[PDB]
Design a protein around this ligand. Structure first.
Ligand SMILES: NC(=[NH2+])NCCC[C@H](N)C(=O)O
Ligand SMILES: [Mg+2]
Ligand SMILES: [Mg+2]
Ligand SMILES: [Mg+2]
Ligand SMILES: [Mg+2]
Ligand SMILES: [Mg+2]
Ligand SMILES: [Mg+2]
Ligand SMILES: [Mg+2]
Ligand SMILES: [Mg+2]
Ligand SMILES: [Mg+2]
Ligand SMILES: [Mg+2]
Ligand SMILES: [Mg+2]
Ligand SMILES: [Mg+2]
Ligand SMILES: [Mg+2]
Ligand SMILES: [Mg+2]
Ligand SMILES: [Mg+2]
Ligand SMILES: [Mg+2]
Ligand SMILES: [Mg+2]
Ligand SMILES: [Mg+2]
Ligand SMILES: [Mg+2]
Ligand SMILES: [Mg+2]
Ligand SMILES: [Mg+2]
Ligand SMILES: [Mg+2]
Ligand SMILES: [Mg+2]
Ligand SMILES: [Mg+2]
Ligand SMILES: [Mg+2]
Ligand SMILES: [Mg+2]
Ligand SMILES: [Mg+2]
Ligand SMILES: [Mg+2]
Ligand SMILES: [Mg+2]
Ligand SMILES: [Mg+2]
Ligand SMILES: [Mg+2]
Ligand SMILES: [Mg+2]
Ligand SMILES: [Mg+2]
Ligand SMILES: [Mg+2]
Ligand SMILES: [Mg+2]
Ligand SMILES: [Mg+2]
Ligand SMILES: [Mg+2]
Ligand SMILES: [Mg+2]
Ligand SMILES: [Mg+2]
Ligand SMILES: [Mg+2]
Ligand SMILES: [Mg+2]
Ligand SMILES: [Mg+2]
Ligand SMILES: [Mg+2]
Ligand SMILES: [Mg+2]
Ligand SMILES: [Mg+2]
Ligand SMILES: [Mg+2]
Ligand SMILES: [Mg+2]
Ligand SMILES: [Mg+2]
Ligand SMILES: [Mg+2]
Ligand SMILES: [Mg+2]
Ligand SMILES: [Mg+2]
Ligand SMILES: [Mg+2]
Ligand SMILES: [Mg+2]
Ligand SMILES: [Mg+2]
Ligand SMILES: [Mg+2]
Ligand SMILES: [Mg+2]
Ligand SMILES: [Mg+2]
Ligand SMILES: [Mg+2]
Ligand SMILES: [Mg+2]
Ligand SMILES: [Mg+2]
Ligand SMILES: [Mg+2]
Ligand SMILES: [Mg+2]
Ligand SMILES: [Mg+2]
Ligand SMILES: [Mg+2]
Ligand SMILES: [Mg+2]
Ligand SMILES: [Mg+2]
Ligand SMILES: [Mg+2]
Ligand SMILES: [Mg+2]
Ligand SMILES: [Mg+2]
Ligand SMILES: [Mg+2]
Ligand SMILES: [Mg+2]
Ligand SMILES: [Mg+2]
Ligand SMILES: [Mg+2]
Ligand SMILES: [Mg+2]
Ligand SMILES: [Mg+2]
Ligand SMILES: [Mg+2]
Ligand SMILES: [Mg+2]
Ligand SMILES: [Mg+2]
Ligand SMILES: [Mg+2]
Ligand SMILES: [Mg+2]
Ligand SMILES: [Mg+2]
Ligand SMILES: [Mg+2]
Ligand SMILES: [Mg+2]
Ligand SMILES: [Mg+2]
Ligand SMILES: [Mg+2]
Ligand SMILES: [Mg+2]
Ligand SMILES: [Mg+2]
Ligand SMILES: [Mg+2]
Ligand SMILES: [Mg+2]
Ligand SMILES: [Mg+2]
Ligand SMILES: [Mg+2]
Ligand SMILES: [Mg+2]
Ligand SMILES: [Mg+2]
Ligand SMILES: [Mg+2]
Ligand SMILES: [Mg+2]
Ligand SMILES: [Mg+2]
Ligand SMILES: [Mg+2]
Ligand SMILES: [Mg+2]
Ligand SMILES: [Mg+2]
Ligand SMILES: [Mg+2]
Ligand SMILES: [Mg+2]
Ligand SMILES: [Mg+2]
Ligand SMILES: [Mg+2]
Ligand SMILES: [Mg+2]
Ligand SMILES: [Mg+2]
Ligand SMILES: [Mg+2]
Ligand SMILES: [Mg+2]
Ligand SMILES: [Mg+2]
Ligand SMILES: [Mg+2]
Ligand SMILES: [Mg+2]
Ligand SMILES: [Mg+2]
Ligand SMILES: [Mg+2]
Ligand SMILES: [Mg+2]
Ligand SMILES: [Mg+2]
Ligand SMILES: [Mg+2]
Ligand SMILES: [Mg+2]
Ligand SMILES: [Mg+2]
Ligand SMILES: [Mg+2]
Ligand SMILES: [Mg+2]
Ligand SMILES: [Mg+2]
Ligand SMILES: [Mg+2]
Ligand SMILES: [Mg+2]
Ligand SMILES: [Mg+2]
Ligand SMILES: [Mg+2]
Ligand SMILES: [Mg+2]
Ligand SMILES: [Mg+2]
Ligand SMILES: [Mg+2]
Ligand SMILES: [Mg+2]
Ligand SMILES: [Mg+2]
Ligand SMILES: [Mg+2]
Ligand SMILES: [Mg+2]
Ligand SMILES: [Mg+2]
Ligand SMILES: [Mg+2]
Ligand SMILES: [Mg+2]
Ligand SMILES: [Mg+2]
Ligand SMILES: [Mg+2]
Ligand SMILES: [Mg+2]
Ligand SMILES: [Mg+2]
Ligand SMILES: [Mg+2]
Ligand SMILES: [Mg+2]
Ligand SMILES: [Mg+2]
Ligand SMILES: [Mg+2]
Ligand SMILES: [Mg+2]
Ligand SMILES: [Mg+2]
Ligand SMILES: [Mg+2]
Ligand SMILES: [Mg+2]
Ligand SMILES: [Mg+2]
Ligand SMILES: [Mg+2]
Ligand SMILES: [Mg+2]
Ligand SMILES: [Mg+2]
Ligand SMILES: [Mg+2]
Ligand SMILES: [Mg+2]
Ligand SMILES: [Mg+2]
Ligand SMILES: [Mg+2]
Ligand SMILES: [Mg+2]
Ligand SMILES: [Mg+2]
Ligand SMILES: [Mg+2]
Ligand SMILES: [Mg+2]
Ligand SMILES: [Mg+2]
Ligand SMILES: [Mg+2]
Ligand SMILES: [Mg+2]
Ligand SMILES: [Mg+2]
Ligand SMILES: [Mg+2]
Ligand SMILES: [Mg+2]
Ligand SMILES: [Mg+2]
Ligand SMILES: [Mg+2]
Ligand SMILES: [Mg+2]
Ligand SMILES: [Mg+2]
Ligand SMILES: [Mg+2]
Ligand SMILES: [Mg+2]
Ligand SMILES: [Mg+2]
Ligand SMILES: [Mg+2]
Ligand SMILES: [Mg+2]
Ligand SMILES: [Mg+2]
Ligand SMILES: [Mg+2]
Ligand SMILES: [Mg+2]
Ligand SMILES: [Mg+2]
Ligand SMILES: [Mg+2]
Ligand SMILES: [Mg+2]
Ligand SMILES: [Mg+2]
Ligand SMILES: [Mg+2]
Ligand SMILES: [Mg+2]
Ligand SMILES: [Mg+2]
Ligand SMILES: [Zn+2]
Lengths: 112, 154, 101, 116, 59, 140
RNA sequence: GGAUGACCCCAGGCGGUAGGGGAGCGUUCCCGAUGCCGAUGAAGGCCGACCCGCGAGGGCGGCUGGAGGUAAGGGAAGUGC
RNA sequence: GUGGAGCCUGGGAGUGAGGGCGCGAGCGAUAACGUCCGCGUCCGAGCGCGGGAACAACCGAGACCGCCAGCUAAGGCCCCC
RNA sequence: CGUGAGGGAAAGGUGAAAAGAACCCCGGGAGGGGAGUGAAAUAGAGCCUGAAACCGUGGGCUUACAAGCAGUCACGGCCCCGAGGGGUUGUGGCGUGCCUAUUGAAGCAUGAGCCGGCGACUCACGGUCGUGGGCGAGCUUAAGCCGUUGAGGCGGAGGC
């Protein structure tokens, strides 16, 4: 049995959040929580939220035990980019891409 | 490219922009531009020689006759404009609808009765033509229709 | 006992029970054919000059087939020359029955 | 009537890309680089089918040479002798005999020495 | 200067190889001797406000 | 029938005395042994030659005026980094390198060729530390 | 040969740019079609180490898809990147 | 002398920047990877194959496809080979 | 966008029916997990199908003494599907991208970041050859007119 959560259209660059998600892949829920809590990255806030949403799903929907939970899989996908004009010298206009992330956390139970 | 709605303006200078040269955005190389050698209104008719089509007419009827699929009739019994009536007559005439029939008669009442049948094509003899003959498995004609036909191919 | 036989312009070491693919032979499936012998070995050695007079190998033709397609493809640069040919080599499959010395 | 590209180009590009599976980076992912890679691939295959025949003959010859020198003669003498003796066993089978049937090969060597 | 520019697009391989040094190292944590919570060493415990076996902070 | 390919074989250790032999003409034979081209099952893409032990490499011989006119050369990559060492000096300093260089130059380039060179053990003086492999003495 | 592109046998030719000629494949549309295939699954998509074809391609099978597609034989072009 | 020989009529072209080499001359300096003609050749179009370390035109040779068969060419046969 | 004359886009599709997801759960919200609707929910409104470039997660093979137009030929190793095949690639052989332009290009000469879609030899009238038919010292109609309503015929002026 697995439980899963997805935070879609999170306004943060995927390459940035992945760095954080890599920190918790395969960790027990408790270990992940401690890591995210003292990870000094903006992305920690978002991955924490998804992590917890997945833990709640596990316990409340899927009859899983909180003390058995671990991050069985996790990944970040790119959402649609928000394109924005960045005015440059000599009348040039560049396009900034403010990128977007779909954050998936999947929890399983580590038996015994 | 001359008939499309855009202006004839050169979209950017010939040289020194670092881009490909262009005139107006109506050029067919542009999405939304004119089309090159696209279709224009066209008359596909041409005058096929009279003797060829008269000959064709005779040959088309001849093909059906050689197959035993040409039948002439004097009259159409009791068909006065009702499909049910033509059906009754057709059954006796050996037309069970298992074969498509080109029915050629000057009798309007007969043509009206048969015209809605899927297996029947109806024509006045002045309209006899080889496409309609070759389209259909059987040819059925009035003695009257047979006569204007023989006049036509004479 | 093994023999070195000659068929389809090539030479093979055959033994009873060997299944072998050779160039296509003009012979019905199920027919048996006799292959020239160049040399015999195993227990006795006899050396052909070039072929040995008495001997033959008896083979049953199992059937004929077409080899797995090979793509023979030709290209010349800057000259717009491209050629694509599919090639399937025909063959006969043989089952070696006996070595008649 | 209009006949837009529709389906046809995608299908052609897919044929090429399927043949290019296994190739490095864009050579298996980009239609253009795949097509270029394949041009060269086909020419090599043709050239190397030819070359494969030479490759193996050279290998047989080397093995035959080593087997001969164990019996006191070199390859070029051995081949002359075989010619004079009228023995026509090819290099592919000579090399096999040299490894799998040393008694028979040694016999062939004798005939070759004698024939000279 | 004369505006140096990349000669070739960086390949997926080379791009990803440059990043072989980019993975984060996890925060280093120890248990707080008082409340057993994980926290960075040599910092005041944010959970109970203890440090050096005494209360330092309202938490 | 496919051409025979050998399963891995216990390599044969061989012992050679270099004393009085002509440098280049001995090298060609060591190379052949290294490649394993003397064996009927020779296969070009595996290391299956002999291990060759050589002794008295310091007593290798050479014709003409090569002792003083043959120059070994090394390039350091630095300006003026071309080093020139005559045969006499090489023999008087690292004698075993003379044969080593001669043979290395006679092996195929590439990974296999480099691996083959490692199967050559050249010693100045009459002794080698390889009694454990019991090298078979070879006249060549 | 056999009589006629029925297929077999013998022989010889078959590198190729500009370029000439020949034979084909596929795309859109019309006749064939008031038909026929189609929810027991159209077109399109994704696989395939299978079948046919020299090849361009064509089948077939699995998955997807969910409403169209269209033969032999011919016709016409906004027809292949 | 039956050849992808020739001649006649007609349809369709492309080409009208050549280049190396050998031989024969002119120009140049008994210079030029020079230049301009003549006879031939090859590359062009055979940047397909072997040799010449590598290399359009030097030597060998005109590649329909396949073969883990044989004989040769030039060139080679101490090792790399 | 331009002072102005003027220039001038992009942007279509849930489903048969909104039945457009009550209510509970994590979350500030967004978003999601259940429940529920539906034949179908990777048809959930950022909605038919959903290619390709491009990004990621998981797995198999493989890689830190190696010289490379990236392939190809051979063999061996491992994995997979069950005298066979598929994947991978250690070693050995061979190997100068594509297109354009040129006497000559891998060329350190042009062009191209990559992918998808748009993108260039046509049509009318006349000519000239060839060709499939019709008729043949003759062949043929044009505009029109009648008919048809995807029917064909008449029309000889005129042309050769
Ligand atoms: N007079 C006639 N029957 N004319 C031909 C038929 C008319 C019409 N197109 C039909 O099929 O119903
Ligand atoms: Mg940190
Ligand atoms: Mg909880
Ligand atoms: Mg700035
Ligand atoms: Mg401005
Ligand atoms: Mg500006
Ligand atoms: Mg400004
Ligand atoms: Mg960018
Ligand atoms: Mg940007
Ligand atoms: Mg215009
Ligand atoms: Mg205009
Ligand atoms: Mg306009
Ligand atoms: Mg306008
Ligand atoms: Mg306008
Ligand atoms: Mg204008
Ligand atoms: Mg204008
Ligand atoms: Mg203007
Ligand atoms: Mg311009
Ligand atoms: Mg310019
Ligand atoms: Mg630019
Ligand atoms: Mg441009
Ligand atoms: Mg540009
Ligand atoms: Mg323009
Ligand atoms: Mg303009
Ligand atoms: Mg315009
Ligand atoms: Mg537009
Ligand atoms: Mg338009
Ligand atoms: Mg156009
Ligand atoms: Mg035009
Ligand atoms: Mg135009
Ligand atoms: Mg009109
Ligand atoms: Mg026309
Ligand atoms: Mg007209
Ligand atoms: Mg009707
Ligand atoms: Mg009807
Ligand atoms: Mg009908
Ligand atoms: Mg009708
Ligand atoms: Mg034979
Ligand atoms: Mg067996
Ligand atoms: Mg075969
Ligand atoms: Mg065969
Ligand atoms: Mg190809
Ligand atoms: Mg090119
Ligand atoms: Mg090339
Ligand atoms: Mg070329
Ligand atoms: Mg080209
Ligand atoms: Mg060229
Ligand atoms: Mg080409
Ligand atoms: Mg197109
Ligand atoms: Mg299209
Ligand atoms: Mg397409
Ligand atoms: Mg294409
Ligand atoms: Mg497709
Ligand atoms: Mg295709
Ligand atoms: Mg690969
Ligand atoms: Mg790739
Ligand atoms: Mg890659
Ligand atoms: Mg890709
Ligand atoms: Mg070949
Ligand atoms: Mg070759
Ligand atoms: Mg050969
Ligand atoms: Mg000897
Ligand atoms: Mg000979
Ligand atoms: Mg021979
Ligand atoms: Mg400066
Ligand atoms: Mg400067
Ligand atoms: Mg600078
Ligand atoms: Mg400055
Ligand atoms: Mg700069
Ligand atoms: Mg640059
Ligand atoms: Mg990657
Ligand atoms: Mg890098
Ligand atoms: Mg508290
Ligand atoms: Mg020896
Ligand atoms: Mg010497
Ligand atoms: Mg020393
Ligand atoms: Mg070497
Ligand atoms: Mg080499
Ligand atoms: Mg040709
Ligand atoms: Mg022809
Ligand atoms: Mg067609
Ligand atoms: Mg097509
Ligand atoms: Mg239409
Ligand atoms: Mg219809
Ligand atoms: Mg229909
Ligand atoms: Mg049905
Ligand atoms: Mg289905
Ligand atoms: Mg369609
Ligand atoms: Mg297919
Ligand atoms: Mg389908
Ligand atoms: Mg419909
Ligand atoms: Mg279709
Ligand atoms: Mg159709
Ligand atoms: Mg058809
Ligand atoms: Mg038709
Ligand atoms: Mg049209
Ligand atoms: Mg077009
Ligand atoms: Mg003739
Ligand atoms: Mg000719
Ligand atoms: Mg000629
Ligand atoms: Mg022509
Ligand atoms: Mg023409
Ligand atoms: Mg010209
Ligand atoms: Mg001209
Ligand atoms: Mg001129
Ligand atoms: Mg000129
Ligand atoms: Mg010139
Ligand atoms: Mg000239
Ligand atoms: Mg000139
Ligand atoms: Mg000359
Ligand atoms: Mg001379
Ligand atoms: Mg001269
Ligand atoms: Mg002169
Ligand atoms: Mg010159
Ligand atoms: Mg000169
Ligand atoms: Mg001169
Ligand atoms: Mg010349
Ligand atoms: Mg040219
Ligand atoms: Mg040549
Ligand atoms: Mg030529
Ligand atoms: Mg060349
Ligand atoms: Mg070559
Ligand atoms: Mg050459
Ligand atoms: Mg060469
Ligand atoms: Mg060479
Ligand atoms: Mg050269
Ligand atoms: Mg040159
Ligand atoms: Mg050449
Ligand atoms: Mg030829
Ligand atoms: Mg020979
Ligand atoms: Mg010679
Ligand atoms: Mg040499
Ligand atoms: Mg050798
Ligand atoms: Mg203004
Ligand atoms: Mg304004
Ligand atoms: Mg304007
Ligand atoms: Mg809808
Ligand atoms: Mg709707
Ligand atoms: Mg429905
Ligand atoms: Mg809340
Ligand atoms: Mg809450
Ligand atoms: Mg919500
Ligand atoms: Mg959730
Ligand atoms: Mg939900
Ligand atoms: Mg339900
Ligand atoms: Mg259903
Ligand atoms: Mg379905
Ligand atoms: Mg779906
Ligand atoms: Mg759907
Ligand atoms: Mg629909
Ligand atoms: Mg969708
Ligand atoms: Mg999507
Ligand atoms: Mg991976
Ligand atoms: Mg090393
Ligand atoms: Mg290693
Ligand atoms: Mg390789
Ligand atoms: Mg091999
Ligand atoms: Mg395998
Ligand atoms: Mg492979
Ligand atoms: Mg393999
Ligand atoms: Mg080899
Ligand atoms: Mg290269
Ligand atoms: Mg080159
Ligand atoms: Mg190309
Ligand atoms: Mg270009
Ligand atoms: Mg140019
Ligand atoms: Mg130029
Ligand atoms: Mg030039
Ligand atoms: Mg290059
Ligand atoms: Mg370059
Ligand atoms: Mg330039
Ligand atoms: Mg370039
Ligand atoms: Mg230019
Ligand atoms: Mg660009
Ligand atoms: Mg790309
Ligand atoms: Mg495209
Ligand atoms: Mg034209
Ligand atoms: Mg037009
Ligand atoms: Mg026209
Ligand atoms: Mg004409
Ligand atoms: Mg005509
Ligand atoms: Mg006529
Ligand atoms: Mg007339
Ligand atoms: Mg006139
Ligand atoms: Zn604490």
């Amino acid at each position: 049995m697995e439980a899963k959560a997805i935070a879609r259209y999170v306004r943060i660059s995927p390459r940035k959040v992945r760095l954080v998600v890599d920190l918790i892949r395969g960790k027990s829920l408790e270990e992940a929580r401690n890591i995210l809590r003292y990870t000094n990255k903006r992305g920690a806030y978002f991955v924490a939220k998804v992590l917890e949403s997945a833990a709640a799903n596990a316990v409340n929907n899927h009859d899983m035990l909180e003390d058995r939970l671990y991050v069985k899989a996790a990944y970040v996908d790119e959402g649609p980019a928000l394109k924005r004009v960045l005015p440059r010298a000599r009348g040039r206009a560049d396009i900034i891409k403010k990128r977007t992330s779909h954050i998936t956390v999947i929890l399983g139970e580590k038996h015994g | 490219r001359g008939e499309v709605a855009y202006s004839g303006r050169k979209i950017w200078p010939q040289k020194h922009t670092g881009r490909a040269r262009h005139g107006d955005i109506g050029a067919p190389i542009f999405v939304g531009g004119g089309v090159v050698f696209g279709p224009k209104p066209r008359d596909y008719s041409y005058t096929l020689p009279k003797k060829v089509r008269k000959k064709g007419l005779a040959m088309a009827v001849a093909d059906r006759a050689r197959e035993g699929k040409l039948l002439l009739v004097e009259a159409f019994a009791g068909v006065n404009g009702k499909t049910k009536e033509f059906l009754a007559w057709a059954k006796e005439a050996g037309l069970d609808g298992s074969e498509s029939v080109l029915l050629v008669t000057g009798n309007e009442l007969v043509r009206r009765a048969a015209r809605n049948l899927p297996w029947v094509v109806t024509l006045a003899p002045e309209g006899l033509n080889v496409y309609d003959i070759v389209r259909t498995e059987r040819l059925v004609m009035d003695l009257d229709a047979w006569e204007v036909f023989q006049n036509r191919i004479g | 006992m093994f023999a070195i036989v000659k068929t389809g312009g090539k030479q093979y070491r055959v033994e009873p029970g060997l299944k072998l693919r050779v160039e296509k032979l003009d012979a019905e499936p199920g027919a048996t054919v006799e292959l020239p012998v160049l040399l015999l070995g195993g227990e006795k050695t006899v050396v052909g000059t070039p072929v040995v007079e008495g001997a033959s190998v008896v083979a049953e033709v199992l059937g004929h087939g077409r080899g797995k397609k090979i793509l023979v493809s030709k290209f010349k640069a800057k000259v717009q020359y491209r050629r694509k040919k599919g090639h399937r080599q025909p063959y006969t499959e043989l089952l070696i029955k006996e070595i008649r010395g | 009537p209009r006949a837009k590209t529709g389906v046809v180009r995608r299908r052609k590009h897919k044929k090429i890309l399927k043949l290019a599976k296994g190739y490095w980076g864009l050579r298996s992912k980009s239609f253009r680089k795949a097509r270029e890679t394949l041009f060269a691939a086909g020419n090599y295959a043709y050239a190397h089918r030819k070359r494969r025949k030479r490759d193996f003959r050279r290998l047989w010859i080397v093995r035959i040479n080593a087997a001969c020198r164990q019996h006191g003669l070199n390859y070029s003498t051995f081949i002359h002798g075989l010619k004079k003796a009228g023995i026509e066993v090819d290099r592919k089978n000579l090399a096999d005999l040299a490894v799998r049937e040393p008694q028979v090969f040694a016999e062939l060597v004798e005939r070759a020495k004698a024939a000279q | 200067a004369k505006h140096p520019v990349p000669k070739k697009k960086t390949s997926k391989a080379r791009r990803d190889a440059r990043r072989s040094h980019h993975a984060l190292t996890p925060p280093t944590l120890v248990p707080c001797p008082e409340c057993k919570a994980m926290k960075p060493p040599h910092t005041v415990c944010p959970e109970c406000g203890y440090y050096a076996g005494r209360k330092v902070l309202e938490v | 029938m496919k051409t025979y390919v050998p399963k891995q074989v216990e390599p044969r250790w061989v012992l050679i005395d270099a004393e009085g032999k002509t440098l280049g003409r001995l090298a060609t034979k060591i190379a052949t042994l290294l490649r394993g081209k003397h064996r009927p099952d020779w296969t070009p893409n595996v290391a299956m030659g002999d291990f060759v032990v050589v002794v008295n490499a310091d007593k290798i011989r050479v014709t003409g005026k090569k002792l003083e006119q043959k120059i070994y050369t090394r390039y350091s990559g630095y300006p003026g980094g071309l080093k020139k060492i005559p045969l006499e000096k090489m023999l008087a300093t690292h004698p075993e390198r003379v044969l080593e260089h001669a043979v290395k130059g006679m092996l195929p380039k590439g990974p296999l060729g480099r691996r083959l060179f490692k199967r050559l053990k050249v010693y100045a003086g009459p002794d080698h530390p390889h009694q454990a492999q019991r090298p078979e003495k070879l006249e060549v």
